[PDB]
Ligand binder design. Structure first.
Ligand code: HEM
Ligand code: HEM
Ligand SMILES: *[C@@H]1O[C@H](CO)[C@@H](O[C@@H]2O[C@H](CO)[C@@H](O)[C@H](O)[C@H]2NC(C)=O)[C@H](O)[C@H]1NC(C)=O
Ligand SMILES: *[C@@H]1O[C@H](CO)[C@@H](O[C@@H]2O[C@H](CO)[C@@H](O)[C@H](O)[C@H]2NC(C)=O)[C@H](O)[C@H]1NC(C)=O
Ligand SMILES: *[C@@H]1O[C@H](CO)[C@@H](O[C@@H]2O[C@H](CO)[C@@H](O)[C@H](O)[C@H]2NC(C)=O)[C@H](O)[C@H]1NC(C)=O
Ligand SMILES: *[C@@H]1O[C@H](CO)[C@@H](O[C@@H]2O[C@H](CO)[C@@H](O)[C@H](O)[C@H]2NC(C)=O)[C@H](O)[C@H]1NC(C)=O
Ligand SMILES: Cc1cnc(NC(=O)C2=C(O)c3ccccc3S(=O)(=O)N2C)s1
Ligand SMILES: Cc1cnc(NC(=O)C2=C(O)c3ccccc3S(=O)(=O)N2C)s1
Ligand SMILES: *[C@@H]1O[C@H](CO)[C@@H](O)[C@H](O)[C@H]1NC(C)=O
Ligand SMILES: *[C@@H]1O[C@H](CO)[C@@H](O)[C@H](O)[C@H]1NC(C)=O
Lengths: 553, 553
């Protein structure tokens, strides 16, 4: 007997449940629908859906008519839409979290064991005919061949939005505080138990690591002086597990919150920047609170930095990324009138989705120099040789690659993509179209409709056999881009909910935490409120380089 | 220079922050007040505070005019009031949690490290004149003397509400799933990382223990057959850490979710009850879903028992506790329209508050028999000798002591109270009056006013020296009861919010979880919705005893 749930019968987020030997029932509770498969809509649901403009139209709106938007932005409407934007997106994401790699059903273990990633759609049942459920072939396309054919970069395709490598290294650095898959526990498990913006890539995912990183004087982090400039300490002075290539001595390793940040100078750039910021904040705080001890200064500084990070990520990172003419605003108070849970759980689909490897260029231009991947990867002196100002200037001037559209991953790192697909198959992720429906979009009817061309569409059709068997991450990276945009609609409509749920779902964004007292007073509160990229860099440097998420022209 | 925060200057939940070398500022944000000490009310606050009757009045209302209430209970006014009460009560408890033993300010460590109990009020600063702040003597009254003088039971004072020992062991069993202070980490730390109704006192507070407890067949837990009856397995079959007296044979040690439950026959009684309920539920589940694996059966059964637990606690336990004519109701949907955080962090004050040892009698009568503490404590055969029915009936018939009033703790266990006071001094809890104010009550102006009598009042006045120096637990246990009640107004006004948050803050109460599919369909859902103590016991027994939370007429 075939598992009926393999047909994914229940629509509109209805929960398929197995009854008896060969029967199923759909839990249609609070879906807005009724019927055998949650297909019969209610009043307001029908009104809502029939009056819903397509995401493409909305995107068009947000990206055109600079007049209208320069007006809107200067009025309360900004907040209004923002709030709307806030309330509509977050709701897509189940909170408290639902399933994980072990349970395709709600369970107490799924809730209490934060060692798991969560998931939005349950896995493909193991007793299913084809790997992706019902459609497709007996064996999924070869991962390697797939990547080589459709994801491998031939000629470099720059991001049409002007995104630079400053953005890229910020994205990598930032996301690697909640994307930390456990190699010992395997796919579906994580070491970043903060499940959000806890800045564990600065202070460590665990207490002992944190303590080894701390000066325990004035709340500050350990550091070393080189050429008159502050840098992370060595593993010698801060005995912390760093993942370096063997043969490199603890004397030559720098210690930071994330074990892998030594493998790239952009990463260690951001570690350096945030370290300096932390200690500078500590200085402000101690100036304001002479009676405070090390602990309170450290903790408060950490809070301020979390606020600053959320503030900048929203008002500049996601800004640049979105290309919206609507000015995005970080203000927790907008949710103080809403039904919002301040908790976050990193999803596996979010992990898969954020593999923005096409961003990385062919080489790395630093001034008149051009360093290859071998020169750049695992380079242990570049940061110290050039300094922060220079690398920030350089990265901010060099453009990143377009994420969506296909054929734009440098061959040096294509293997990652391969592995992603493979992990997707171990994680038994549902097909792309299922996730499409899951985030409020119509499923595609053909590969042509996905790619917007015919060649790749034809060959993909050859490989998969059915569009309903197209895999999630391939689907994201091969989908046609919005006009002049950095990726397609799926990347946005799937990524945005996770993104803002993780940003605003942070406890500091709660009525309980969002106070001056929490940040040591008005000075800290303002540090959070007025945080920009430019300030974050220049306030901790001697000189001020070009600092921006986009190229200067 | 004296710490100004020692004077507790900040009013109405304002946050005192130490500025400069001898200054302070109050964070008055969203308190409803303004001014230096947050003493200047906003218009709506003022209005609200003028129209608000006292807690005693509300108590009178809830405890008089059975007619009016019998009308309200047959209407939607029940739901309206219940919702009112829910909102109002829950808004007192900070969510996300604020402070812990290490941190008297908001920190990321206090949010993320769930090994800590939380606290509503910060500790008395370590740089204060008197132990309680600025009032009282340099030394607190001797805990032992305090206990002997004001807590030692002379004559047994039965609870005027009709409470039995079935209730007492229920309260103990139930609350020991989230009260598990760490003997190794010390005061202010917990092993129950669940921080709520997770039923770890059945399944274990860690995964390893859980697995050792599980049959891994059909979702059930291991068990043993004695005299044709089902009991928890022996340690020999389920090798887990249980705290038994050295010398007791392993085949005489039953393995349950909570390590200390072998020390009392009441505890092991309830443990047995819940075990049988779990396996029975599994029978129902598997009958409904033959294709299900042991894991899914287990997890679903667990969630069902959690639901039944909150159901019974709210509609019968708390009902008997409060004595309200308002029939309380467990309905998560009452909160679907409001702003509520489905998370809980066990507060240390809640721990202290819930020390209801006066409930325990002088002896434990079982039918014609009457056992002593030396016969009842650590008795490892009593439960099997009498059986479930017999013990349930027995405990249901024998009365329990009144909690409030004073001088009603049996001398066998009085030491506990001593150790509590001591710990309250370790925890540096604020004085009774500060917590009174924190929970929307007016501070007591004398011990006279507190006790309602003159003897205890005068001696207490001599010992403490000032009313504003009266400690938390002493104030709770010595405060005059409501007319014919089991305790006074403080035990209710501080106990209610915590309890409330603990029950409804459970993620199963969430709109995300509160679906039939979560409980394996209509059947499981109905089990939760119609759960009953009477049913809990009699459905798993052979014969049906007297089972209730109050003595018969
Ligand atoms: C030279 C630049 C980069 C290199 C060498 C690199 C390499 C890698 C490698 C080797 C992994 C682990 C793969 C595995 O263990 O199978 C990884 C993971 C990942 N990378 Fe990249 N990457 C680069 C840039 C980026 C950028 C710019 C992003 C932007 C978001 C990114 C996103 C991710 C994500 C989301 C993961 C998953 C991490 C986890 O699951 O814990 N990478 N990368
Ligand atoms: C024969 C009956 C009882 C005995 C022998 C007993 C004994 C004890 C003992 C020895 C402790 C630990 C004290 C320490 O470690 O210093 C304790 C703690 C405690 N007791 Fe009882 N008790 C009894 C009844 C009850 C009841 C009916 C309740 C109902 C609420 C209760 C509530 C508590 C609580 C909440 C704790 C704190 C546990 C923790 O923080 O981990 N006790 N009791
Ligand atoms: C969270 O779940 C994981 C997965 O079950 C737990 O790790 C497992 O522990 C069991 C029993 O202790 C072992 O048999 C498995 O080998 C473990 N699995 C893996 C992949 O390591 C983990 O202990 C749980 N975490 C908590 C805090 O309970
Ligand atoms: C790491 O990067 C540094 C740059 O800081 C590289 O050093 C430069 O590389 C070439 C020499 O072959 C020239 O551009 C410069 O003369 C070097 N600059 C300095 C300051 O020495 C270095 O080659 C890289 N290291 C590795 C192992 O690739
Ligand atoms: C939660 O906090 C406690 C207290 O800080 C941690 O326990 C301490 O850990 C440090 C370093 O690991 C030790 O030096 C202390 O002796 C420990 N104190 C106690 C009382 O155990 C605990 O590890 C933290 N837990 C988590 C998960 O972070
Ligand atoms: C544990 O409780 C049992 C009851 O199950 C006690 O055994 C009974 O003791 C009384 C004495 O007061 C006798 O009259 C009964 O005949 C006994 N019943 C049985 C079945 O033996 C026992 O004394 C208690 N054990 C301890 C160590 O105190
Ligand atoms: C590929 C993407 C990853 N994350 C994206 N996020 C957004 O599109 C998005 C936000 O993340 C967000 C953050 C804070 C407030 C509001 C928004 S958003 O409207 O959901 N939007 C731009 S898009
Ligand atoms: C001494 C007390 C300990 N716990 C108490 N709880 C109540 O007074 C109380 C509840 O616990 C509660 C539970 C569920 C819904 C509503 C209520 S309540 O209104 O806060 N109330 C009776 S009183
Ligand atoms: C519901 O789904 C099942 C399986 O896909 C199908 O047999 C049935 O016809 C569907 N009914 C409706 C109304 O969509
Ligand atoms: C505020 O409280 C402090 C401490 O009790 C007191 O000294 C001060 O006079 C108060 N100020 C006002 C304006 O009430």
């Amino acid at each position: 007997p075939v598992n009926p749930c393999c047909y994914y019968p229940c629509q509109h987020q209805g929960i398929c449940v197995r009854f008896g030997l060969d029967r199923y029932q759909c839990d249609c509770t609070r879906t807005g629908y009724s019927g055998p498969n949650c297909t019969i809509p209610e009043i307001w649901t029908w009104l809502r859906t029939t009056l819903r403009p397509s995401p493409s139209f909305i995107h068009f709106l947000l990206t055109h008519g600079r007049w209208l938007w320069d007006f809107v932005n200067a009025t309360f409407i900004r907040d209004t839409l923002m709030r709307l934007v806030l309330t509509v997106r977050s709701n897509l994401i189940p909170s408290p979290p639902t399933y994980n790699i072990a349970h395709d059903y709600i369970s107490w273990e799924s809730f209490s064991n934060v060692s798991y990633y969560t998931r939005i759609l349950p896995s493909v049942p193991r007793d299913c005919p084809t790997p992706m459920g019902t459609k497709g072939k007996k064996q999924l396309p070869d991962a390697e061949f797939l990547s080589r054919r459709f994801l491998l970069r031939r000629k470099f395709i720059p991001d049409p939005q002007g995104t630079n490598l400053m953005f890229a290294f910020f994205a990598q650095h930032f996301t690697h505080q909640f994307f930390k898959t456990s190699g010992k526990m395997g796919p579906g498990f994580t070491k970043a138990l903060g499940h959000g913006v806890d800045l564990g890539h600065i202070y460590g995912d665990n207490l002992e690591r944190q303590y080894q990183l701390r000066l325990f004087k004035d709340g500050k982090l350990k550091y070393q002086m080189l050429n008159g400039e502050v840098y992370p300490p060595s593993v010698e002075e801060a005995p912390v597990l760093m993942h370096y290539p063997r043969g490199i001595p603890p004397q030559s390793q720098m210690a930071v919150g994330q074990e892998v940040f030594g493998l790239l100078p952009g990463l260690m750039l951001y570690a350096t920047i945030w370290l300096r910021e932390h200690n500078r904040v500590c200085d402000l705080l101690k100036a304001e609170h002479p009676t405070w001890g090390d602990e309170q200064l450290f903790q408060t500084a950490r809070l301020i930095l979390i606020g600053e990070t959320i503030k900048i990520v929203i008002e500049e990172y996601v800004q640049q990324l979105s290309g919206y003419f609507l000015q995005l605003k970080f203000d927790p108070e907008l949710l103080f009138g809403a039904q919002f849970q301040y908790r976050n759980r990193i999803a596996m689909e979010f992990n898969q989705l954020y593999h923005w490897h096409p961003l990385m260029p062919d080489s790395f231009r630093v001034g008149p120099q051009d360093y290859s991947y071998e020169q750049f990867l695992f380079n242990t002196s570049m940061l110290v040789d050039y300094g922060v100002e220079a690398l920030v200037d350089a990265f901010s001037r060099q453009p990143a690659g377009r994420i969506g559209g296909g054929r734009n991953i440098d061959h040096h790192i294509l293997h990652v993509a391969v592995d992603v697909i493979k992990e997707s198959r171990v994680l038994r992720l549902q097909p792309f179209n299922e996730y499409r429906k899951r985030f409020g979009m119509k499923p595609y009817t053909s590969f042509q409709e996905l790619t917007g061309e015919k060649e790749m569409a034809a060959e993909l059709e050859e490989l998969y056999g059915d569009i309903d068997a197209l895999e999630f991450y391939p689907g994201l990276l091969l989908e046609k881009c919005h006009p002049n945009s950095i990726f397609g609609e799926s990347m946005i409509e799937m990524g945005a909910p996770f993104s803002l749920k993780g940003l605003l779902g942070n406890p500091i964004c709660s009525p309980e935490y969002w106070k001056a007292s929490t940040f040591g007073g008005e000075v800290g509160f303002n540090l959070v409120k007025t945080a920009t990229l430019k300030k974050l860099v220049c306030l901790n440097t001697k000189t001020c380089p070009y600092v921006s998420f986009h190229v200067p022209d």
